[PDB]
Subunit: 131 residues, 4 copies
């Protein structure tokens, strides 16, 4: 399994990302940065449809994860990719937190924090992609 | 130290200097530095303990765009990420993704082989310089 | 004579910043970062209503200004501040580019770039603050 | 009258001067918000500009106090510093005079301590970075 969770969005790429930020902030998560992959492609002289990455998370929860296995800090804070395919359909892609826990071999001390990350990712993803 | 696409080497420098060496070597190769995330500082703002731990995000947009033209989902795992972190015994480690592992995860095709090899070269060169002396 | 331009916004602080970003990108400007002053006050245990800064600009235009007087790079890229007052009213505050031209003693070689910055700041502000 | 710009010569390259700003600032408990490579934006624009980099950093607790007095100073916060190399190879570090910013936004007497802290923070960081 890849651990990639991709859902269709009812909004454009820009609006989907702003819905991720708005919902993450309202649940007390910080927004760290946004990486406009589409704009980077345009400056390289290459073609790419709208593609944006947003990085967000709750450092309280992420710290407990890293206290168990520090290498998960490579994959934190939470990342979400909104992108438009060639047909004009918009998708929203995130990591399955349980898959991330398996990747870094997290233990029982991370259990509550993983479920918090599962709930946070699901709530933000469902809100941002739905109406 | 390799497991599940994670590559970890020991660094001869502090966490801060290791991240500075990542940024310097990447910029000298024409790559851009996108952001830095101080996980250690975030732990302190939360009132929790954590040794120095810092993430840096960098890469070459020309190479990354070619990968995303193949499978867009790899844009979730780009730009390149590196984590410098100090353990309890005072040792400093540098952890990066194996680019060939990230290519499998997103099922990249033959048309990405040149760009994947370039990503492997950039990752290995930055990591060797940052952790070495 | 502060060189501050402040107009009422028809949108919330978050929505006003989103409209700044969307309008800037559609005009070929890059978005460099966003600073959530209000969230920074909350992390410090202090009170502050919604307050957000966004930094954006066109490097082609900004480079011309810095080729003239490099110190203007301290005040570039373009900055915009959306903020809510105690009554709930939202404001959008930007620098007058002509005032920025005076602060750094720009010359005739920057005239086209200053006009472009005046046009860019004016177009982004009216769109974001207007409905 | 005045410009409010303080420029000192640095003994280090542009990149090293900026990294020394970040290192000193973070050691004092300030956050680093972003860096803007003006020189890279010039090369991407196809224009010639020597190395030029901006860094944005500050103490959000001290910034919040100032913004509680006059919110518009949030347009000019967090603290900004510009390292740049001239045509002869000399590197300069340019910052805002915090007292000049207090004048610009008409800060009152209640901000005087917070203004002094910004003066101390700016001077301490700049002396280390350029010296
Ligand atoms: F601009
Ligand atoms: F500050």
């Amino acid at each position: 399994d890849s651990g990639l969770v991709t859902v269709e969005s009812r909004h454009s790429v820009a609006e989907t990302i702003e819905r991720v930020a708005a919902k993450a902030k309202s649940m007390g998560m910080n927004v760290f940065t946004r990486v406009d992959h589409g704009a980077g492609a345009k400056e390289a002289g290459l073609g790419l449809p709208p593609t944006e990455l947003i990085i967000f998370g709750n450092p309280q929860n992420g710290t407990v994860l890293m206290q168990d296995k520090r290498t998960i800090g490579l994959d934190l804070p939470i990342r979400a990719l909104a992108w438009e395919d060639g047909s004009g359909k918009v998708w929203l892609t995130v990591n399955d937190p349980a898959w991330l826990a398996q990747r870094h071999s997290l233990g029982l001390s991370s259990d509550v924090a993983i479920k918090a990350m599962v709930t946070g990712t699901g709530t933000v993803t469902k809100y941002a992609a739905g109406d």
